[PDB]
Write a protein that binds this ligand. Structure first.
Ligand SMILES: [Zn+2]
Length: 197
């Protein structure tokens, strides 16, 4: 009735870790990642490219799961879901449950899970190796509530946990990042980094 997934970074046998575009903080950026904060800033329901880097190719049937949790210990048993307003909106892509914060864009093989025991939401896709001309695999995520949505992200720091799993669900790798969904990611990142003095 209470639990939390592990957030322990784990590179594993295949050298798994995340990467992000180096987009800077101009006002026009639709998303941007802060290395100093390990924090992705993005806009509501827009493309967030997240890169999967491995040193060696994982086995057939490997999968990539994303799940959101509250970062603070006093809230980590609370399931992260969309707020009442956005859950009722007509923004369904035909695949994602209306309550799920995290969607995958542009992948018809995305699978969405309400865990039967923990009730937590996640979205999982097949692992694909990098395409011709690329050195990493990119997943396009969408975050479907704002950080300020009460009943949703609740103005709480939220962590996204990305896990590399084998076909049976066993852990092969894990990485994570804080996520802020906001109107102007470039300005918000530069403002939060200004305090790093
Ligand atoms: Zn919302």
């Amino acid at each position: 009735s209470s639990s939390v997934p592990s957030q322990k970074t784990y590179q594993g046998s295949y050298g798994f870790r995340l990467g992000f575009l180096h987009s800077g903080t101009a006002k026009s950026v639709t998303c941007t990642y802060s290395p100093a904060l390990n924090k992705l800033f993005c806009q509501l329901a827009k493309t967030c490219p997240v890169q999967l880097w491995v040193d060696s190719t994982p086995p057939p049937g490997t999968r990539v799961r994303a799940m959101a949790i509250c970062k603070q210990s006093q809230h980590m048993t609370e399931v992260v879901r969309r707020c009442p307003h956005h859950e009722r909106c007509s923004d369904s892509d035909g695949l994602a449950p209306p309550q799920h914060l995290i969607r995958v864009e542009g992948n018809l093989r995305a699978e969405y899970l309400d865990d039967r025991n923990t009730f937590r939401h996640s979205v999982v896709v097949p692992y694909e190796p990098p395409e011709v001309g690329s050195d990493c695999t990119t997943i396009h995520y969408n975050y479907m509530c704002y950080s300020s949505c009460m009943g949703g992200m609740n103005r709480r720091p939220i962590l996204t946990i990305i896990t590399l799993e084998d076909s049976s669900g066993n852990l092969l790798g894990r990485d994570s990042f804080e996520v802020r969904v906001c109107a102007c990611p470039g300005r918000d990142r530069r403002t939060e980094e200004e305090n790093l003095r």
